[PDB]
């Protein structure tokens, strides 16, 4: 009964007419907790988490409904709560704005009661930068009686002029190549074709792993087996472009290994999530970022709800990404591949533009 899955029963105390600082979405036949808003009883108890779901609230089933009756139920009950759930699978940094913003005109915000309008020249407490596209914040001089938090756009520092310079690729120390884009628009096939049709002109970066040494991969041919203590020490030092736990072990990618590959006359290839760029630019690798994007819905459905969400996610990675230096519109595959080879061969006989910092 009640799904018969890994079930937990939790208790949270709620008064009358008091929001509980949780954001509930509505996707396929189930209700999903989406955010935890600080300063609310949910954060105080520190029990609920994002990604979970709901079965029944105070003994009344939930699955099979929309959000509005859930809202009506929660806005009419007080006292001790009873929730049924299955589990999931910082420090203040005062800032000062330099523009204007007003949520009621922005058709993009992931809620409408957490806007937090503010004029130019204010001061903000920022509490969490966890979701790197929407920060949680408090306006200075109003801290206590908000009472909850607010959301503010996560524009990274972007100037209104810079200083660029010409740069010529040397004879035999070639710049990396770094592909980014949405999750399901054929990056992997492109990588495999590039590494298979041409075999002696590309390479890769061997990662770090804290697993056990199986009897198929020896010393430095496929991994860099180490002890976990060194791994957390390196994370603290900040030597990792990207790192993520998986299966009780740790993976990643270093910065020395990329130098080993780039230091012998080959073109490194990679693939990244949109998070890591901030760490990559500040170093001196001198990357070259390429954005692979899908075309409109009609031709894509020709190629192969899910279409709409993929177009939407494509939209998000632009309008707050301005680093990269070229966009490839995916099409007939063996035309995008030709375009990619054209671009990469172009670098050898045509100088390029880099911010002048990377040379001083």
């Amino acid at each position: 009964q009640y799904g018969g899955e890994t079930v937990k029963i939790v208790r949270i105390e709620k008064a009358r007419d008091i929001p509980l600082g949780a954001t509930v979405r509505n996707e396929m036949d189930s209700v999903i907790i989406s955010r935890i808003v600080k300063g609310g009883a949910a954060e105080k108890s520190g029990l609920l988490h994002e990604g979970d779901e709901v079965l029944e609230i105070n003994g009344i089933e939930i699955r099979g409904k929309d959000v509005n009756e859930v809202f009506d139920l929660l806005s009419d009950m007080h006292g001790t709560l009873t929730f049924v759930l299955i589990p999931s699978q910082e420090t203040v940094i005062h800032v000062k704005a330099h523009f204007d913003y007003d949520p009621s005109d922005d058709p993009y915000v992931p809620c409408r009661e957490l806007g937090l309008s503010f004029q130019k020249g204010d001061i903000l407490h920022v509490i969490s930068q966890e979701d790197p596209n929407w920060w949680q914040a408090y306006r200075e001089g109003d801290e206590d009686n908000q009472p909850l938090a607010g959301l503010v756009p996560g524009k990274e520092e972007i100037l209104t002029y810079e200083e660029m310079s010409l740069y010529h690729q040397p004879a035999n120390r070639k710049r990396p190549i770094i592909l980014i884009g949405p999750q399901n628009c054929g990056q992997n096939e492109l990588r495999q074709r590039l590494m298979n049709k041409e075999k002696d002109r590309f390479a890769s970066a061997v990662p770090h792993t804290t697993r056990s040494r199986r009897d198929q991969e020896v010393a430095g041919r496929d991994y860099h087996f180490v002890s976990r203590q060194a791994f957390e020490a390196d994370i603290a030092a900040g030597k990792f472009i990207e790192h993520g736990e998986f299966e009780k072990n740790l993976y990643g990618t270093s910065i020395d290994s990329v130098r080993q590959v780039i230091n012998s006359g080959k073109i490194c290839l990679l693939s990244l999530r949109t998070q890591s760029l901030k760490t990559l630019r500040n170093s001196d690798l001198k990357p070259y970022i390429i954005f692979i994007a899908p075309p409109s819905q009609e031709r894509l459905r020709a190629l192969l709800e899910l279409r709409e969400i993929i177009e939407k996610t494509r939209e998000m990675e632009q309008n707050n990404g301005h680093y990269f230096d070229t966009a490839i519109v995916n099409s007939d595959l063996d035309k995008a591949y030709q375009e990619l080879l054209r671009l990469i061969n172009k670098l050898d006989t045509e100088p390029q533009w880099v911010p002048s910092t990377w040379l001083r």
Partner: peptide, 9 residues
């Protein structure tokens, strides 16, 4: 216009 965006409980 993804969905009705969200809701605060």
């Amino acid at each position: 216009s993804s969905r009705v965006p969200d809701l605060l409980v």
